[PDB]
């Protein structure tokens, strides 16, 4: 039972295409419980400035009422079965998933359909959601990391729909009318842009039957540029500095993603406080970089260490470090896929992203392909001598100026 041998034991995810275009995917397993869900290829990047907060508002009011049963009735039905409904919205995906028992599958799928097709947008509920989101703005204001990453996206993509926040501006959510939400639903929540994904104790034909019964009535019928800018909010009274630096990364459909993951896994928090590396991926672009918290007096040293690690990977990457990174990536993948909710989310996102559920054997073969020479070449392709996007939430004063940061992206020795 070697690792490569063990990967074959993973059951495949059967995929079927309905008449209206909805893609139904399942990963059956000997699990007492399952997590069904609907994933939609609609996010903030598909919204104009007129309706920037439309998707987040729809997520807020999705469980607050549908035509068949009022919001209280929907919530009571969820709670009585013991299930947990959840939803999330990214700049490119939107998911509603019901986590329940294997024998509760027939109801849950129906629930999803009731949420997806016929959503009751009560005006009073809409105003209540307005108030809730207005409070949630101040709630999110506390989170420094989220503000930093929003700054990073805004400065990196600027004049692109990929740069606006998922929540949207306060004015936009304030003036977002019901008709705008209905138009957003009509133009976006439609098959074949939907994947009904389930895993665990679910039989694929059962899921297909439920989808045809409930999710069968769904209607059948700008250049993204990376600008290496920076944003610098100071607020010197904050305890620790937050910084996120990134460069444009490849989209979802690119072989270089695995090498970049290995490079990130290869990337000393002693100088820092909590330093992390991220490889956010989108359809055609992506943010590959790092994010760390700093003392007021140690931003420069941490930035120097991070950029030195980047340069070392780009120029001279030994085989031992690359092997360690590959092992770390394999362990991270397999450990992340543990759990019913993770595999369901992976199925949905993969279908919305690759058009297919890439098996673990392919992932491991691709990782085995990765070599120190490949790591160096791809890192030089994407990291070496590239204009970065920097976002700093203060206290930032020791953060090097953009010319210094840019000059730190190449080595005079090399």
């Amino acid at each position: 039972a070697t690792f490569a041998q063990a990967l074959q034991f993973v059951p495949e995810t059967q995929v079927s295409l309905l008449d209206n275009g909805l893609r139904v995917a399942s990963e059956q397993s000997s699990q007492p419980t399952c997590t069904v869900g609907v994933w939609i290829d609609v996010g903030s990047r598909f919204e104009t400035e007129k309706n920037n907060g439309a998707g987040y508002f729809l997520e807020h009011l999705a469980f607050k009422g549908t035509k068949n049963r009022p919001g209280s009735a929907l919530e009571k039905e969820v709670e009585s079965m013991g299930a947990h409904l959840n939803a999330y919205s990214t700049r490119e995906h939107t998911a509603y998933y019901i986590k329940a028992l294997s024998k509760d599958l027939p109801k849950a799928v129906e629930l999803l359909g009731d949420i997806v097709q016929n959503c009751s947008l009560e005006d009073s509920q809409i105003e209540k959601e307005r108030d809730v989101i207005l409070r949630e703005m101040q709630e999110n204001d506390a989170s420094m990391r989220d503000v930093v990453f929003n700054y990073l996206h805004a400065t990196a993509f600027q004049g692109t729909p990929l740069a606006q926040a998922v929540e949207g501006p306060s004015e936009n959510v304030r003036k977002l009318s019901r008709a705008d939400l209905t138009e957003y639903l009509s133009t976006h929540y439609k098959a074949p842009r939907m994947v009904l994904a389930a895993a665990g104790g679910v039989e694929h034909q059962q899921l297909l039957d439920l989808a045809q019964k409930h999710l069968g009535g769904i209607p059948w019928t700008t250049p993204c540029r990376f600008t290496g800018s920076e944003i610098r909010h100071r607020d010197d009274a904050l305890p620790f500095a937050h910084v996120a630096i990134a460069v444009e990364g490849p989209g979802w459909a690119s072989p270089d993603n695995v090498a970049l993951q290995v490079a990130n896994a290869i990337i000393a928090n002693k100088l820092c406080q909590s330093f992390q590396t991220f490889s956010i991926c989108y359809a055609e672009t992506g943010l590959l970089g790092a994010h760390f918290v700093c003392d007021r007096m140690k931003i420069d040293d941490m930035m120097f260490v991070l950029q030195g690690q980047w340069m070392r990977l780009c120029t001279s990457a030994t085989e031992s470090e690359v092997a360690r990174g590959k092992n770390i990536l394999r362990n991270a993948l397999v450990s992340h896929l543990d759990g019913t909710t993770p595999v369901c989310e992976d199925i949905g996102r993969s279908l919305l992203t690759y058009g297919r559920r890439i098996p673990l054997a392919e992932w491991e073969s691709r990782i085995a392909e990765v070599d120190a020479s490949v790591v160096r070449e791809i890192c030089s392709k994407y990291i070496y001598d590239q204009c970065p996007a920097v976002a700093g939430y203060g206290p930032i004063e020791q953060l090097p100026d953009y010319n210094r940061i840019r000059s730190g992206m190449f080595w005079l020795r090399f």
């Binding site: 909010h233 100026d401 953009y402 010319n403």
Partner: protein, 53 residues
């Protein structure tokens, strides 16, 4: 003319080096100025906002 040559035997060489350095400066000054503008454009074009709570 001979007395001028005796006073300045380097006259021709001085003129030649002057022409060469004039051409050199005509090449360099716009280039170095462009380099300075390129390096300083980040500050020259940066926009700042004040957002009190």
């Amino acid at each position: 003319t001979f007395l001028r040559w005796a006073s300045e035997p380097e006259h021709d060489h001085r003129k030649r080096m002057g022409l060469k350095m004039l051409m050199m400066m005509a090449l360099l000054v716009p280039l170095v100025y462009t380099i300075k503008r390129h390096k300083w454009s980040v500050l020259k074009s940066r926009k700042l906002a004040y957002r009190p709570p």
